[PDB]
């Protein structure tokens, strides 16, 4: 298909990544994932705003405006005739002889974006998935959606090896987030999720879900909970652009309540549906 390369759309075949691209030697870059429903991009403005925020946090200056970035994305979707799936795009500090410190400002960031056809996770959304607890060994700037993802890779692999969908991470016995999703817990009709600080990535789906809770008049409390408290929640689920609202019905052999998707998770899934294009 076609790939967004810097400021132009070209056939995948024309893209050339240098061995000294800082994204390849230091994971020095940021990224975003946007879901596309039947040709329509979901919350694209919010994801673009976060790409710029992430880049700002590590001092990368994206060579062009958000408006232009949005236009390039539209083109990318049209040229690939993407129906339902997602757009992946990243920005690295650029190509320069290997050195940890920033290169001369005359070095242009490298932008890469492409699409992938991917249906909504129907089965998971209806039946829920299994998860496992994994100690959070990530760096202390999880608020940045960066390419330094080795911690997430090791966590997800451990989960997959155990036949689990996601790994629920914990730092000092406190549940932070999944390897690539935010975690929510419901207890006595109240929604709980770890607050948005450097310990987690402030997900767009996470913000949408919180808005949905307010819409159905459900109390929301952003205070963290421990692994012990998590196993005692009435309901539990994770969120991400591609997982939407996926119920977690069991963790390491221990069923969450009765092992079925709860009524509040269902109500939130219904409210979320009204938001989809």
Ligand X SMILES: *Cc1c(COP(=O)(O)O)cnc(C)c1O
And the tokens for 127? 């039946």
Angle at 82 between CA 157 and CA 177, to 5 degrees: 30
Residue 24 interacting partner from its own copies, ligand X, none (CB closer than 5 to 8 Å by kind)? its own copies
Size of the site for ligand X (CB under 6 A): 14
Q: Does 181 bind ligand X (CB under 6 A)?
A: yes
Q: Does 9 bind its own copies (CB under 8 A)?
A: no
Could you say which residues in the range 138-167 bind ligand X, by CB under 6 A?
Answer: 145
Nearer to ligand X, 92 or 181 (CB): 181
Best CA proximity match to 64, nearest among 4, 3, 7: 7
Contacts for 174 with CB less than 8 Å, ≥ 6 apart: 194, 224, 225, 226, 227
Mask: binding to its own copies, 212-251, rule CB under 8 A, as x and -? Answer: ----------------------------------------
Q: Does 182 bind ligand X (CB under 6 A)?
A: yes
Residue 269 interacting partner from ligand X, its own copies, none (CB closer than 5 to 8 Å by kind)? none
Mask: binding to its own copies, 119-138, rule CB under 8 A, as x and -? Answer: ------------------xx
Could you say which residues in the range 198-237 bind ligand X, by CB under 6 A?
Answer: 201, 203-206
Best CA proximity match to 90, nearest among 151, 167, 3: 3
63-97 residues labelled b (16+ CB within 10 A) or e (exposed) = eeeeeebeebbeebbebbebeebbbebbbbbbbbe
Residue 64 interacting partner from ligand X, its own copies, none (CB closer than 5 to 8 Å by kind)? none
How many angstroms separate the Cα of 213 from the Cα of each of 6, 94, 202, 233? 39, 41, 17, 17
Q: At closest approach, how far in Å is the CB of 114 from its own copies?
A: 7
Q: Does 53 bind its own copies (CB under 8 A)?
A: no
Cα Rg of the chain, angstroms: 19
Mask: binding to ligand X, 45-64, rule CB under 6 A, as x and -? Answer: --------------------
Q: How far apart are CA 95 and CA 92, in angstroms?
A: 8
Q: How far apart are CA 201 and CA 62, in angstroms?
A: 21
Q: Does 26 bind its own copies (CB under 8 A)?
A: yes
User: Active-site residue among 35, 130, 145, 156?
Assistant: 145
Residue 240 interacting partner from ligand X, its own copies, none (CB closer than 5 to 8 Å by kind)? ligand X
Q: At closest approach, how far in Å is the CB of 142 from ligand X?
A: 6
**Annotated catalytic residue 145:** yes
Best CA proximity match to 22, nearest among 198, 180, 148, 153: 148
Q: Is 12 exposed, middle or buried (0-12, 13-18, 19+ CB in 10 A)?
A: exposed
How many angstroms separate the Cα of 267 from the Cα of each of 178, 260, 263, 277? 22, 14, 6, 19
Interacting residues toward its own copies by CB under 8 A: 3, 12, 15-19, 21-28, 31, 58-59, 88, 90, 97-98, 100-102, 112, 114, 116, 137-141, 146-157, 159-160, 179-180
Instruction: Tell me which residues are annotated as active site.
Output: 145
């Amino acid at each position: 298909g076609y790939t967004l390369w810097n400021d132009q759309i070209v056939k995948d075949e024309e893209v050339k990544i240098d061995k000294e691209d800082r994204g390849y030697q230091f994971g020095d870059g940021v990224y975003e994932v946007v879901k596309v429903y039947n040709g329509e991009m979901f919350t694209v403005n919010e994801h673009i705003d976060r790409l710029y925020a992430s880049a700002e946090k590590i001092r990368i200056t994206i060579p062009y405006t958000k408006d232009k970035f949005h236009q390039l994305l539209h083109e990318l979707v049209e040229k690939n005739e993407l129906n339902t799936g997602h757009i992946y795009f990243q920005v690295t500090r650029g190509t320069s002889p290997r050195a940890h410190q920033f290169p001369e400002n005359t070095v242009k960031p490298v932008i890469i974006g492409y699409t992938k056809e991917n249906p909504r996770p129907l089965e998971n959304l209806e039946k829920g998935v299994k998860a496992t607890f994994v100690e959070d060994i990530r760096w202390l700037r999880c608020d940045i959606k960066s390419l330094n993802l080795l911690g997430a890779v090791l966590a997800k692999q451990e989960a997959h090896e155990k036949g689990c969908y996601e790994a629920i991470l914990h730092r000092n016995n406190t549940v932070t987030s999944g390897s690539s999703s935010n975690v929510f817990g419901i207890k006595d009709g109240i929604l709980y999720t770890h607050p948005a600080n450097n310990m987690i990535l402030k997900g767009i789906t996470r913000d949408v879900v919180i808005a949905c809770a307010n819409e159905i008049n459900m109390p929301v409390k952003e205070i963290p909970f421990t692994t012990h408290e998590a196993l005692k929640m009435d309901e539990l689920f994770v969120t991400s652009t591609t997982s939407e609202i996926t119920p977690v019905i069991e963790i390491d052999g221990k069923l969450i309540r009765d092992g079925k998707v709860g009524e509040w998770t269902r109500k939130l899934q219904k409210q979320f549906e009204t938001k989809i294009p």
